[PDB]
Design a protein around this ligand. Sequence first.
Ligand SMILES: Nc1nc2c(ncn2[C@@H]2O[C@H](COP(=O)(O)OP(=O)(O)OP(=O)(O)O)[C@@H](O)[C@H]2O)c(=O)[nH]1
Ligand SMILES: Nc1nc2c(ncn2[C@@H]2O[C@H](COP(=O)(O)OP(=O)(O)OP(=O)(O)O)[C@@H](O)[C@H]2O)c(=O)[nH]1
Ligand SMILES: [Mg+2]
Ligand SMILES: [Mg+2]
Lengths: 422, 126, 425
Amino acid sequence: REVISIHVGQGGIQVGNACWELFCLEHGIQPDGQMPSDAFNTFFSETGAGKHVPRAVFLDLEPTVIDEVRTGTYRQLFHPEQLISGKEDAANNFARGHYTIGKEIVDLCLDRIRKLADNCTGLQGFLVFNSVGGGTGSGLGSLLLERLSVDYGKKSKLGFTIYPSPQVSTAVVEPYNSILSTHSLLEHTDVAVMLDNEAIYDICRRNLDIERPTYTNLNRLIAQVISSLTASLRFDGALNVDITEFQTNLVPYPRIHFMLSSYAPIISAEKLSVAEITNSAFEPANMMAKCDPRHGKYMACSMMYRGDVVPKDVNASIATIKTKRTIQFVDWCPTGFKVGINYQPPTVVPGGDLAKVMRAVCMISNSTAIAEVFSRLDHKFDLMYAKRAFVHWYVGEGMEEGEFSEAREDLAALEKDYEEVG
Amino acid sequence: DLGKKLLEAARAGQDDEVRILMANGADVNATDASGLTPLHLAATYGHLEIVEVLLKHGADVNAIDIMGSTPLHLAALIGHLEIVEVLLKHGADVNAVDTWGDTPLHLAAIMGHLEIVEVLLKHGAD
Amino acid sequence: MREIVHIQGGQCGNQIGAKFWEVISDEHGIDPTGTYHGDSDLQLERINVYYNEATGGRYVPRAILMDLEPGTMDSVRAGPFGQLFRPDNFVFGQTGAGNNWAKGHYTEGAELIDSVLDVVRKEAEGCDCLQGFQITHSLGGGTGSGMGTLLISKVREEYPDRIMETFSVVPSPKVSDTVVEPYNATLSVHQLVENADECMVIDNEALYDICFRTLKLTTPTYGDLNHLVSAAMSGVTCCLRFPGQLNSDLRKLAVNLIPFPRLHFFMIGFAPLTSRRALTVPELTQQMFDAKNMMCAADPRHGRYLTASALFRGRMSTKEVDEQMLNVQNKNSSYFVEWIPNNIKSSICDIPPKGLKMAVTFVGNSTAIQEMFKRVAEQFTAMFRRKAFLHWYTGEGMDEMEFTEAESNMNDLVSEYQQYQDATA
Ligand SMILES: Nc1nc2c(ncn2[C@@H]2O[C@H](COP(=O)(O)OP(=O)(O)OP(=O)(O)O)[C@@H](O)[C@H]2O)c(=O)[nH]1
Ligand SMILES: Nc1nc2c(ncn2[C@@H]2O[C@H](COP(=O)(O)OP(=O)(O)OP(=O)(O)O)[C@@H](O)[C@H]2O)c(=O)[nH]1
Ligand SMILES: [Mg+2]
Ligand SMILES: [Mg+2]
């Protein structure tokens, strides 16, 4: 049952850098690939010489970010064939990544992915890491999704997808790339987890009291969420044990598959109970996407506890929350609430920001409230598109103007979908 | 045709050719196809001595071409200060208006010829 | 995206170009022999953007020097860094263009353009990954204006996928009372609208006013004007020459600044202004926006910004820049369009310019620049209606209809600025 991770563009690669750092620490793998002391083989191959190698490719249209991997702490961990770089990037232009520039490297990318799959006894699916606000993660990422849907037709695809914020933005065209990407994700992923930089940045500023956070701060928090959500893939567990179970547990209607996640407790290393962390998991302040899940309804909710967590205490906290009635599920929905406990507590990253804790919880849910995130980006899109601002940059890089309205319409349909479910 | 030779010598600054043509009877007030005179052309291209010799020999200082341009308009547009002053000395109309509604002052101001602007104002430009 | 190929053309082009290379070589630690001396490794991280590395360990500007007259390049050779330019990258004629855009674009310039293109190709083909071209020239003369735009056309044909950027000096009677300059500049703006991606406007009207009124210099020499130009050029190019993310290459700069392909003429403000105590961040953010600090004689409060970037330089707080950027956007909310979300962005470069600890360069796409085009258009129209010196241009084979075509293209540009200035959300 192996899982192959695909990391595209800067955001996808640097979140990948944080995830693989934590995966190695959790499985006791050194940056050398050695393991001094089965489940973790879903994410790592093993060589004759005892090297444990991530089942992953890092893909970018420029070499800067990839070079830092090639020369950094984990230069011995990846095979060089796993690390692919172009010469000129997509310049924040979805069209460049998807058409004129991405077309020249996608076959090379699919051959390196095919080398990974050829070393899989029973490949079960892909994890695809990228941002939507740039040009490479958005455009080459979507092109790779289209090709993987044709070449690996029977394999599930789960996105870990970074959405943009004004606070860490270098491109005015982010709303365009965001909508074009989301149109791709609607058709070519089974599940997508929204990593909204607006919310994550604010958590670092507030809960972690970091005055102006770095990508490393944001990424180390993201890695703890992604580690919690993939814990059942890499260890023996009983909830979300394969990629396909994410769809079955979380997705009652095929295209409504964008997930709101949370983590508790989120506390700084300077200087709580099952009931307390369970309440915190339903609070806006702990959500990885900027919305109020009290204003919406839940189609699905999976709670994945980690550490010193007694099942009776989980049941009591949930009982109490149900009586409080602020948290509402869609009546008769074919999905719902599920709970899982892994009895290992979260792993501490050296030099991280998060305090060591004996128990934690990570929620992944399907909530109508996530429409707020799309609605804000759709409004920004609409203001610019009404004047066709910047559109020529996309049309000149191989995209037909019709793809703008197609994507927007897809997003309009998704927004109405959330409204009707509510 | 001596008139047309005079037009061309005034335009080209050929001082000796001007004097010879004028001495052989050339029409000092000849016009080209659009009504430009030898004084218009010498004023435009900056030939002060030809401007003065034409004015001494019956040139109409306020001739207009078919667009209403006077020699003073053209001198103020191109920036010839000493020519502007000579034309004024010989009675150029400081407030002549062409078919575009411009005066010599407006053209000098547009082109940034500040000394000419001041001279035109001292001579009563409106 | 890595290397940029620079071409400086004509007297203005070569004088402002020489100062550019002096100023950035100092910033990068390069001496006139091409040898690096400096502390920060930030100085060499993106040195390849403007410099080739020679065998000797020395750094050589990726620069081509072009003129139809040998004079200014001879004095460039004698200038401070003159011995660092590749000798075989000097391409000069003997004739001159006589301030005549036709001689530069169709006759004398046409006779020399293949020798220029030879050197340009050699530099372009030697690049690992070419970003594009940087052209420094005046629009009011003949060579920089007419032959510069010829070169832009020829390179655009051979390199249609690379970015074409210019530092274009716009004429003003305050600096040069030469009445064909509006012809030459209007003909050039026509070329620039069709064949350049990015035009960094340098208005001699604005430089003259700054030197006269704010710096109290009664009679500004070319040296005084060019002191401002080189400060702007260093500040505008800082984002390409030092590590960073915002506008870090020519194509990303273009995608952020240009919503509509023809409207690619930028207003540049910078602070502090200096002649040849550190400012606070509130002082930088206020001044960078001020008409008195702009390189374009257009009042930014007479139009709206489509987009802009503020590039701060020096040891200053990200927190404080955030705070003041919020303040200046609130106070100037009437001068930004409402239908482009987060259209003003900022960054900080740790390396400050020479003699300063705090500085900023503001680069914007403002509809107010139409005021500058209207000024030139009025002069063009005054001359063209009286057909003054037109034979100088048709005598070199140019059609009068090119005058009307350029005039009309620049009038449509003005119209389009006004369309987006009045647009509503
Ligand atoms: N959370 C997080 N977001 C990032 C990181 N790096 C970039 N981003 C976000 O990703 C978006 C910018 O896109 P990038 O991923 O940098 O662009 P790219 O995929 O490399 O594509 P091009 O550079 O345009 O070729 C913005 O929303 C950024 O905030 C990161 O390390 N962590
Ligand atoms: N700011 C600035 N403007 C200059 C400089 N040199 C010339 N100019 C301006 O540029 C215009 C004249 O163009 P030039 O560069 O001198 O002409 P050229 O390109 O060498 O063309 P020809 O001499 O006609 O062959 C006028 O507007 C001058 O004011 C300079 O060093 N700095
Ligand atoms: Mg990138
Ligand atoms: Mg010259």
